[PDB]
Short mmCIF file of C-alpha atoms and ligand atoms in Angstrom, two decimals:
data_model
loop_
_atom_site.label_atom_id
_atom_site.label_comp_id
_atom_site.label_asym_id
_atom_site.label_seq_id
_atom_site.Cartn_x
_atom_site.Cartn_y
_atom_site.Cartn_z
CA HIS A 1 1.73 -30.72 30.36
CA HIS A 2 3.50 -28.55 27.78
CA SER A 3 6.86 -26.78 27.42
CA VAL A 4 7.52 -23.03 27.58
CA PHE A 5 7.91 -23.01 23.80
CA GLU A 6 4.27 -24.12 23.64
CA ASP A 7 2.98 -21.31 25.85
CA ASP A 8 0.41 -18.94 24.36
CA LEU A 9 1.93 -15.74 23.01
CA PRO A 10 0.18 -12.38 22.59
CA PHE A 11 -1.93 -12.15 19.43
CA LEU A 12 -0.67 -10.22 16.42
CA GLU A 13 -3.23 -7.52 15.62
CA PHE A 14 -3.04 -4.78 13.01
CA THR A 15 -4.01 -1.44 14.57
CA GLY A 16 -3.44 0.85 11.61
CA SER A 17 -5.88 2.21 9.05
CA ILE A 18 -8.00 -0.28 7.09
CA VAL A 19 -9.40 0.79 3.70
CA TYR A 20 -12.42 -1.34 2.79
CA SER A 21 -13.41 -1.36 -0.90
CA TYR A 22 -16.30 -3.27 -2.45
CA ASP A 23 -16.79 -1.50 -5.80
CA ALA A 24 -14.70 -2.18 -8.90
CA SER A 25 -13.87 1.37 -10.00
CA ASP A 26 -13.16 2.49 -6.42
CA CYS A 27 -10.74 -0.44 -6.14
CA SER A 28 -9.01 0.42 -9.42
CA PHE A 29 -8.38 4.00 -8.29
CA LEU A 30 -7.23 2.83 -4.86
CA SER A 31 -4.73 0.56 -6.63
CA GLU A 32 -3.42 3.56 -8.57
CA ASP A 33 -3.13 5.40 -5.24
CA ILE A 34 -0.94 2.52 -4.07
CA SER A 35 1.12 2.62 -7.26
CA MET A 36 1.73 6.35 -6.76
CA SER A 37 3.15 5.79 -3.27
CA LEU A 38 5.62 3.06 -4.25
CA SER A 39 8.80 2.87 -6.31
CA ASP A 40 10.16 -0.05 -8.34
CA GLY A 41 11.27 -2.86 -6.04
CA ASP A 42 9.01 -1.94 -3.12
CA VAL A 43 7.12 -4.70 -1.34
CA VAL A 44 3.58 -5.13 -0.11
CA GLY A 45 2.07 -7.73 2.18
CA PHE A 46 -0.40 -10.00 0.36
CA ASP A 47 -3.06 -12.58 1.25
CA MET A 48 -6.46 -13.56 0.02
CA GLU A 49 -9.44 -15.29 1.46
CA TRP A 50 -12.33 -17.37 0.17
CA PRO A 51 -15.47 -18.96 1.65
CA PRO A 52 -15.46 -22.67 2.68
CA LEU A 53 -18.22 -23.19 0.10
CA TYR A 54 -17.71 -25.30 -3.02
CA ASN A 55 -19.17 -24.36 -6.39
CA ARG A 56 -19.52 -26.65 -9.40
CA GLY A 57 -16.85 -29.08 -8.20
CA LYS A 58 -14.24 -26.71 -6.79
CA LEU A 59 -13.51 -24.17 -4.05
CA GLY A 60 -15.54 -21.00 -4.29
CA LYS A 61 -13.78 -18.06 -5.95
CA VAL A 62 -11.41 -15.73 -4.13
CA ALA A 63 -13.67 -13.28 -2.29
CA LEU A 64 -11.15 -10.94 -0.71
CA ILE A 65 -7.68 -9.67 -1.51
CA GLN A 66 -5.58 -7.90 1.11
CA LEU A 67 -2.59 -5.66 0.52
CA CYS A 68 -0.52 -4.12 3.31
CA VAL A 69 1.59 -1.26 1.95
CA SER A 70 3.02 0.08 5.21
CA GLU A 71 3.00 -0.62 8.93
CA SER A 72 0.00 1.70 9.28
CA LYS A 73 -2.19 0.97 6.24
CA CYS A 74 -3.85 -2.12 4.76
CA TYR A 75 -6.32 -2.41 1.88
CA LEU A 76 -9.18 -4.92 1.84
CA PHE A 77 -10.51 -5.45 -1.69
CA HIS A 78 -13.81 -7.33 -1.39
CA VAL A 79 -13.84 -8.59 -4.98
CA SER A 80 -16.79 -10.93 -4.40
CA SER A 81 -19.01 -7.84 -4.08
CA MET A 82 -17.69 -6.25 -7.29
CA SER A 83 -19.42 -6.71 -10.67
CA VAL A 84 -16.11 -7.30 -12.42
CA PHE A 85 -12.51 -7.84 -11.33
CA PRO A 86 -11.02 -4.33 -10.90
CA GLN A 87 -8.56 -3.46 -13.68
CA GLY A 88 -6.31 -1.34 -11.46
CA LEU A 89 -5.92 -4.25 -9.03
CA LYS A 90 -5.16 -6.65 -11.87
CA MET A 91 -2.40 -4.31 -13.07
CA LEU A 92 -0.90 -4.00 -9.61
CA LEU A 93 -0.91 -7.79 -9.17
CA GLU A 94 0.54 -8.40 -12.58
CA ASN A 95 3.12 -5.60 -12.21
CA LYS A 96 6.67 -6.98 -12.00
CA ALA A 97 7.83 -3.71 -10.42
CA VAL A 98 5.87 -4.46 -7.23
CA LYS A 99 6.80 -7.42 -5.05
CA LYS A 100 4.05 -9.29 -3.18
CA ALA A 101 5.09 -11.14 -0.01
CA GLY A 102 3.25 -13.94 1.75
CA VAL A 103 3.22 -17.61 2.79
CA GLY A 104 1.57 -20.12 0.48
CA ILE A 105 1.56 -17.41 -2.16
CA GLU A 106 2.34 -19.72 -5.09
CA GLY A 107 -0.88 -21.53 -4.24
CA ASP A 108 -2.68 -18.19 -4.26
CA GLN A 109 -1.10 -17.52 -7.66
CA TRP A 110 -2.70 -20.64 -9.14
CA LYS A 111 -6.12 -20.05 -7.57
CA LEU A 112 -6.12 -16.44 -8.76
CA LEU A 113 -5.31 -17.59 -12.30
CA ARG A 114 -8.06 -20.21 -12.28
CA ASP A 115 -10.61 -17.87 -10.68
CA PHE A 116 -9.96 -14.60 -12.55
CA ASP A 117 -7.32 -15.41 -15.15
CA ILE A 118 -5.00 -12.97 -13.36
CA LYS A 119 -1.27 -13.72 -13.45
CA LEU A 120 0.40 -12.67 -10.20
CA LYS A 121 3.88 -11.37 -10.99
CA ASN A 122 6.91 -10.89 -8.73
CA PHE A 123 5.55 -12.73 -5.69
CA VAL A 124 7.84 -14.01 -2.95
CA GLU A 125 7.29 -17.00 -0.68
CA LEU A 126 8.44 -15.88 2.78
CA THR A 127 9.33 -19.51 3.52
CA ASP A 128 12.23 -19.21 1.07
CA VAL A 129 13.23 -15.71 2.15
CA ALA A 130 13.27 -16.86 5.79
CA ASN A 131 15.30 -20.00 5.09
CA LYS A 132 17.76 -17.86 3.14
CA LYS A 133 18.22 -14.95 5.57
CA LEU A 134 17.86 -17.06 8.73
CA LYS A 135 20.19 -19.77 7.40
CA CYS A 136 17.86 -22.68 8.03
CA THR A 137 15.66 -25.19 6.23
CA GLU A 138 12.24 -25.11 7.85
CA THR A 139 8.74 -25.64 6.49
CA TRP A 140 7.40 -22.34 7.80
CA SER A 141 3.76 -21.33 8.09
CA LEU A 142 2.72 -17.70 8.49
CA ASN A 143 2.00 -18.37 12.17
CA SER A 144 5.33 -20.06 12.94
CA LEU A 145 7.19 -17.16 11.29
CA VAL A 146 5.19 -14.61 13.29
CA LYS A 147 6.07 -16.51 16.47
CA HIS A 148 9.76 -16.87 15.57
CA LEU A 149 10.34 -13.30 14.38
CA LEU A 150 7.78 -11.25 16.30
CA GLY A 151 6.99 -13.23 19.44
CA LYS A 152 3.27 -13.37 18.72
CA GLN A 153 0.70 -15.79 17.33
CA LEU A 154 -2.07 -15.23 14.79
CA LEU A 155 -5.73 -14.89 15.79
CA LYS A 156 -7.16 -18.40 15.63
CA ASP A 157 -10.94 -18.40 15.93
CA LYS A 158 -11.87 -20.94 13.24
CA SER A 159 -15.37 -19.46 12.93
CA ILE A 160 -13.62 -16.32 11.67
CA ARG A 161 -10.78 -17.68 9.55
CA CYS A 162 -13.17 -20.13 7.93
CA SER A 163 -16.13 -17.75 7.86
CA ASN A 164 -18.14 -16.78 4.77
CA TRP A 165 -15.72 -14.31 3.19
CA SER A 166 -18.08 -13.65 0.26
CA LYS A 167 -20.78 -12.31 2.58
CA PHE A 168 -21.10 -8.51 2.38
CA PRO A 169 -20.33 -6.64 4.48
CA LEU A 170 -17.26 -8.01 6.24
CA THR A 171 -17.64 -7.98 10.04
CA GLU A 172 -15.10 -6.07 12.14
CA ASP A 173 -13.54 -9.37 13.22
CA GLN A 174 -13.16 -10.48 9.59
CA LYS A 175 -11.48 -7.19 8.66
CA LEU A 176 -9.09 -7.52 11.60
CA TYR A 177 -8.21 -11.12 10.75
CA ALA A 178 -7.81 -10.41 7.02
CA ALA A 179 -5.83 -7.17 7.39
CA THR A 180 -3.51 -8.79 9.90
CA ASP A 181 -2.55 -11.65 7.51
CA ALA A 182 -1.33 -9.09 4.96
CA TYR A 183 0.32 -6.96 7.63
CA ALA A 184 2.20 -10.04 8.84
CA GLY A 185 3.63 -10.66 5.38
CA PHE A 186 4.80 -7.06 5.08
CA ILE A 187 6.46 -6.92 8.52
CA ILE A 188 8.10 -10.33 8.15
CA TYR A 189 9.59 -9.41 4.78
CA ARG A 190 10.76 -6.04 6.08
CA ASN A 191 12.43 -7.55 9.13
CA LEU A 192 14.09 -10.35 7.15
CA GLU A 193 15.35 -7.97 4.46
CA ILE A 194 17.32 -5.78 6.88
CA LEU A 195 19.28 -8.79 8.18
CA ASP A 196 22.88 -8.88 6.96
N1 DGP B 1 2.37 -25.59 -10.90
C1 DGP B 1 1.06 -25.61 -10.70
N2 DGP B 1 0.56 -25.91 -9.49
C2 DGP B 1 -0.83 -25.87 -9.48
C3 DGP B 1 -1.68 -25.58 -10.53
N3 DGP B 1 -3.01 -25.65 -10.11
C4 DGP B 1 -2.92 -25.97 -8.86
N4 DGP B 1 -1.61 -26.13 -8.40
C5 DGP B 1 -1.23 -26.50 -7.01
C6 DGP B 1 -1.96 -25.66 -5.92
C7 DGP B 1 -1.78 -26.57 -4.72
O1 DGP B 1 -0.57 -26.27 -4.00
C8 DGP B 1 -1.80 -27.95 -5.30
C9 DGP B 1 -2.97 -28.84 -5.08
O2 DGP B 1 -4.02 -28.15 -5.64
P1 DGP B 1 -5.37 -27.71 -4.86
O3 DGP B 1 -6.77 -28.58 -5.42
O4 DGP B 1 -5.53 -26.07 -5.24
O5 DGP B 1 -5.21 -27.95 -3.30
O6 DGP B 1 -1.49 -27.82 -6.67
C10 DGP B 1 -1.12 -25.25 -11.83
O7 DGP B 1 -1.71 -24.97 -12.85
N5 DGP B 1 0.28 -25.30 -11.81
MN1 MN B 2 -3.50 -17.16 2.84
MN1 MN B 3 -5.40 -15.30 5.47
#
């Protein structure tokens, strides 16, 4: 027997346009497209995924990077299928003029550095933004924030969230799951920011 607070909520699902990129140069130009549509201070939703496979003593490298730039468009950069880490993406991630929002993003910062020697700049942990704007002191997760602020829960099929993200091509379920994590970060930040 469970309480009403424990009831199952509708699932959060991104229904906008998903741009799938799996080639380095394509990704670099896409990143410049993004840079052309934003101004200093603008935010983007961010998340990354990696396969549950270990390589030479540590987690396999980041295989996918997701960026949600608006409520209708998310980019899926399948870096595991690229021959080199796209320069345009590196610049966007290292650009202090663009804020990246997510949960557990500091951890992503360190894994990105170890995996590609990329130094994520101007990232924001939604946990801190939420505690600040919502005047509380909670240990938020992306899911708990989605529930609290949007009245929905995140897709939870473990065989998808813990699937082989380095396997090309991504399935439609993987794209949905991955794009929605980035979308969540964008929407959450947007909604929290307007509060005053
Ligand atoms: N400050 C800092 N934290 C790190 C560094 N490398 C890893 N971490 C963090 C990431 C995790 O939150 C935690 C435990 O590491 P992990 O094996 O990635 O689960 O330590 C680093 O170079 N600096
Ligand atoms: Mn994540
Ligand atoms: Mn994710």
